[PDB]
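stage 2 :: seqdesign
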């Protein structure tokens, strides 16, 4: 059971590197359009263990994180073998779930057991692969 407000919208975001103009803030702009050409999808360099993070600004009790994958270019696969991690205000892990793939689905809903965290991080565990997210939405436990 989760609230409906997406508390990641408009928050500070960052990522391991930036390529092709794909600013980290594109995953928290309020627009889940998955076509990279419509400018709302992030992109890091091709690198090992690429990551992306949003700072919620305060510790919140997180119940759901929703990832929206890139959809154009036949490169949706790059979002595979990754972790979704929640960190506290000291940047220590308070929760971690691993996923092998989204299975062609355009989105992934990740549920957390009422976890108090300030940061939400997506981490690829693959070599030489860029991280691109169309949007990451985060909802409080109800
Ligand atoms: C190979 C590469 O990175 N080329 C860049 C380019 O992106 C490619 O553009 C073509 C059409 O010309 C296709 O849409 C390809 O799918 C696309 O390559 C994909 O997307 C890029 C961003 C990378 O992730 C890449 O590895 C991948 O295969 C890019 O073109 C722009 O962005 C694309 C998606 C598209 O909307 C274009 O029409 C657009 O102008 C350009 C300019 O940003 O940069 C190239 O280096
Ligand atoms: Ca977006
Ligand atoms: Mg278009
Ligand atoms: Mg344009
Ligand atoms: Mg910060």
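stage 2 :: out
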């Amino acid at each position: 059971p989760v609230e409906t407000e997406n508390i990641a919208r408009g928050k500070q975001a960052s990522q391991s590197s930036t390529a092709h103009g794909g600013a980290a803030t594109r995953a928290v702009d309020g627009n889940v359009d998955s076509d990279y050409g419509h400018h709302s999808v992030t992109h890091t360099n091709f690198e090992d263990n690429a990551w992306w993070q949003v700072d919620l600004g305060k510790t919140e009790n997180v119940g759901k994180v929703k990832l929206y994958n890139r959809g154009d270019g036949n490169v949706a696969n790059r979002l595979s073998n990754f972790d979704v991690v929640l960190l506290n205000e000291a940047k220590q892990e308070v929760a971690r779930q691993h996923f092998d793939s989204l299975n062609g689905k355009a989105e992934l809903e990740v549920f957390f057991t009422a976890k108090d965290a300030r940061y939400v991080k997506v981490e690829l565990k693959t070599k030489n692969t860029p991280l691109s997210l169309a949007e990451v939405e985060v909802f409080r436990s109800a």
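stage 3 :: structure notes
- The longest strand covers residues 51-69.
- Residues 22 and 42 are 4 Å apart (CA to CA).
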